[PDB]
Amino acid sequence: PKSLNFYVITISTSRYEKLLKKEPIVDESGDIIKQLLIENGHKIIGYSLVPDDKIKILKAFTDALSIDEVDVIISTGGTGYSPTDITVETIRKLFDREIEGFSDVFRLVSFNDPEVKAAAYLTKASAGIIGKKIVYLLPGSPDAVKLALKELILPEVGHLVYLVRS
Amino acid sequence: PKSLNFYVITISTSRYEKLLKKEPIVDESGDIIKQLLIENGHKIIGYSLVPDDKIKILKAFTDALSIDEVDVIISTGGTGYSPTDITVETIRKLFDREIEGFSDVFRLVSFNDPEVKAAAYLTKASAGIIGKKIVYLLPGSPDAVKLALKELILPEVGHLVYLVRS
Amino acid sequence: PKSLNFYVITISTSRYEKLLKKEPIVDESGDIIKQLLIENGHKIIGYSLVPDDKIKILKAFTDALSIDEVDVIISTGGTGYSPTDITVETIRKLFDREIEGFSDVFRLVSFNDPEVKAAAYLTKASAGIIGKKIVYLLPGSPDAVKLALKELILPEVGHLVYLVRS
Amino acid sequence: PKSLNFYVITISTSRYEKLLKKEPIVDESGDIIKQLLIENGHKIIGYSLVPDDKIKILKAFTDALSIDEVDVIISTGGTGYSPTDITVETIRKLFDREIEGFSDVFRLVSFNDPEVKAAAYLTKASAGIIGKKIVYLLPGSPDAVKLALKELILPEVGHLVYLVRS
Amino acid sequence: PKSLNFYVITISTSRYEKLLKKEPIVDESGDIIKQLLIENGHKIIGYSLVPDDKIKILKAFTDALSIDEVDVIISTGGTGYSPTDITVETIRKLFDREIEGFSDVFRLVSFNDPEVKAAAYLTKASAGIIGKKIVYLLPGSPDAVKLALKELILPEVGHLVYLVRS
Amino acid sequence: PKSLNFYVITISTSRYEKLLKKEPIVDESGDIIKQLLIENGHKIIGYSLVPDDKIKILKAFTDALSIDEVDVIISTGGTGYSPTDITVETIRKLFDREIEGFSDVFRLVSFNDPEVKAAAYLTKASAGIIGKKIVYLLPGSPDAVKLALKELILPEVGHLVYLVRS
Ligand SMILES: [Mg+2]
Ligand SMILES: [Mg+2]
Ligand SMILES: [Mg+2]
Ligand SMILES: [Mg+2]
Helix, strand or coil: CCCCEEEEEEECHHHHHHHHCCCCCCCHHHHHHHHHHHHCCCEEEEEEEECCCHHHHHHHHHHHHCCCCCCEEEEECCCCCCCCCCHHHHHHHHCCEECHHHHHHHHHHHHCCCCCHHHHHHCCCEEEEECCEEEEEECCCHHHHHHHHHHHHHHHHHHHHHHHCC | CCCCEEEEEEECHHHHHHHHCCCCCCCHHHHHHHHHHHHCCCEEEEEEEECCCHHHHHHHHHHHHCCCCCCEEEEECCCCCCCCCCHHHHHHHHCCEECCHHHHHHHHHHHHCCCCHHHHHHCCCEEEEECCEEEEEECCCHHHHHHHHHHHHHHHHHHHHHHHCC | CCCCEEEEEEECHHHHHHHHCCCCCCCHHHHHHHHHHHHCCCEEEEEEEECCCHHHHHHHHHHHHCCCCCCEEEEECCCCCCCCCCHHHHHHHHCCEECCHHHHHHHHHHHCCCCCHHHHHHCCCEEEEECCEEEEEECCCHHHHHHHHHHHHHHHHHHHHHHHCC | CCCCEEEEEEECHHHHHHHHCCCCCCCHHHHHHHHHHHHCCCEEEEEEEECCCHHHHHHHHHHHHCCCCCCEEEEECCCCCCCCCCHHHHHHHHCCEECHHHHHHHHHHHHCCCCCHHHHHHCCCEEEEECCEEEEEECCCHHHHHHHHHHHHHHHHHHHHHHHCC | CCCCEEEEEEECHHHHHHHHCCCCCCCHHHHHHHHHHHHCCCEEEEEEEECCCHHHHHHHHHHHHCCCCCCEEEEECCCCCCCCCCHHHHHHHHCCEECCHHHHHHHHHHHCCCCCHHHHHHCCCEEEEECCEEEEEECCCHHHHHHHHHHHHHHHHHHHHHHHCC | CCCCEEEEEEECHHHHHHHHCCCCCCCHHHHHHHHHHHHCCCEEEEEEEECCCHHHHHHHHHHHHCCCCCCEEEEECCCCCCCCCCHHHHHHHHCCEECCHHHHHHHHHHHHCCCCHHHHHHCCCEEEEECCEEEEEECCCHHHHHHHHHHHHHHHHHHHHHHHCC
């Protein structure tokens, strides 16, 4: 299988505000995505951290989309029903095609986690295609991100990139 | 855990026609919802019964939304593919935010019931948020309503109400 | 249980091009659909083969819809994320009502097939209602079509036809 | 021509807050609508005053829609681009059918007013049909309301009610 | 200037029913369209007559779209607010791209006709593009069809066909 | 009246291709916008030139939206029915609120020009609000841009900016 190039975006107001104050931050979810993607033979070619702000989130995504070498963009954060969760409403609109089934299949595997169960209906984690690039909008939770990567992204992303570019 | 205030809406033309004549009605599904809610420490602060009529359905929901003390509205009926089933089409247009995953997660738990299985794809049961209130639109079937309450609403609704109001 | 009348549409550019040249084609998925329907007491009252072309797909479907005796239309092909897959985007527009849950329940059954698993989120197989006729848009894959027929269509299609004509 | 029955809704936060404090209010726009509708042989069968609040606006409309004798509902207020203008976004969704051309034709006649001109593109005044009733969502401005009534509503509303009920 | 090939579709339930009975019909609007097109150097390469039935309307349009030589499809009938008027709702779905401004510019020219004026907001006449073919959905009214042809279609249709095939 | 800060975006593949080679460019439409704005006391705080490419268009707009000091963004190009015109389809998906009437009011003033007339229905020029900023998407034609600026933007934009920020 090909090594693919990934850009990672963390959407977290608390962490962004610390970055502004030059304070130490731990980005557990972003770290997990990088670690797993690298462990599996892929490359991280960029990373950004933004708060729950429409314009800032759009700029983070367009910056990544504008790098020709990027194959896949993965974000973590802002896909639930907190009043300030706006990631899906901001980005999903931009997809050339929504990968419609990613949302329900992610909720299916989430429902199977005995620590999640019915909480599965409280995520809007989504995937789509823009140009020849794939985009995954994942939850803030480290366990959720790990689940999405291992069960859904790592096994199929190669074939999906191939397919979209065929 | 917090006692929450619920408003129950039964959508049934046959039962509504009896109501108009003050003839006896058995509302099995509405009664199941009320009983399960009370057994779990919640309160029923309102109830209404309407037929499959767009205006009457809209009024039933707006009358409930107008009560400041209501936290959650649950309806039963009119969420399938009978020509006269219009509940979801009517009330989705009120949502501030659709709780998108409720539909497929409800169909997942329904499919898993060996008495239901593939019949799961014949429901459009849905949920959403209007203001600081949660709305669940459930099937007419007593067994479907019991499943939704026990497996999906009772376990998650407290945290969901908190989240939407945070 | 009614014998129902089915019209079968294969959407395959490679096979269509062979047709034009008057060469042998082998349509495994269409053949599977026909055999499983007949074996279950249903009738095949028409069949057509078209490429991934919008107008030709629309014509195939409207020709079938224009036959009063047709109860159900089932197509195979063009429901994935290949750049040329346009079946769902083309026909889903024509639905009076989308049978919304067919998509996710199909992906649920697909995901539980140990040979498919995560590949489940790469399909957009869908169903809908036009007039008093039911329409299923299935994948090109022979295994997917068998799964859809055995698990979802054959068990519920009788009741669904009844229901929409109620 | 028939005498038709109208329900008038004023959407104004300032006026609503005075009503709560039992203070005198002047509703110039509502008064103009009543006066002109009555001068032209029609009847006013109800009136309500609400602020720019989604739930309160929905309740005002459903209350009017639920009166069988009502033929037409006319509202004034909240159809522009103030952050708090939400009338169109709240009600337009509820239409069975939008009367699509009302919006642009109203902007056409507004553009012709030498005191409005290009300000015409800053209104979203709209019309639609719910059940057998017509709904007009008009601006807050008295001159705008007068214009809508004289040029668009009074001349055509009779035929439109007839048509919708045919 | 190209001679273009036009297909003409009349949507009229009363005239269709006469056809079935083999009685004389008189189609004034279709006749106007044909005469004005021919008089302007264009060709009529097909014609059909259908009632206000979704499937029959879809079949009329797809039959025309399936003729390679057809450049433009023009229909007359079913674009108002009669409960049986379904032309726009049916065909507008099929557009690759809606020619968005045809609707309001048609209503502008209509409004300026001193015999139409405010009746202008009661039409939904529309235009769109499917493949490399242009489609105009015009009212049933003979005067409306003449106006559309003379003021909007004949002057711009050549350039529009050129443009979409660019 | 307030001096406002504008960001001008030219969308032209031919000019962008020249830019890449640092070949001379004449951008008549962009220059007209800049000149009229400056003559009316406004400031140009940014400019970019992009081709008809979805990602590049999205980046141009997000780079402008990211400048706190920008009040209004005006683009020229790609708002017609050429197959490669994608400006409106791309940027409408960014709007918080579409300024719905800008489209038809622009077509009204365009139709009124005797050099344009029915050509008015071949544009999709649009406007919207993102955050506290206004966005106008104008045609490529120099005469169209001049008309939009003088008749629709310069007279109303000051009050509109105030309103959106109130
Ligand atoms: Mg665990
Ligand atoms: Mg059981
Ligand atoms: Mg005046
Ligand atoms: Mg001039």
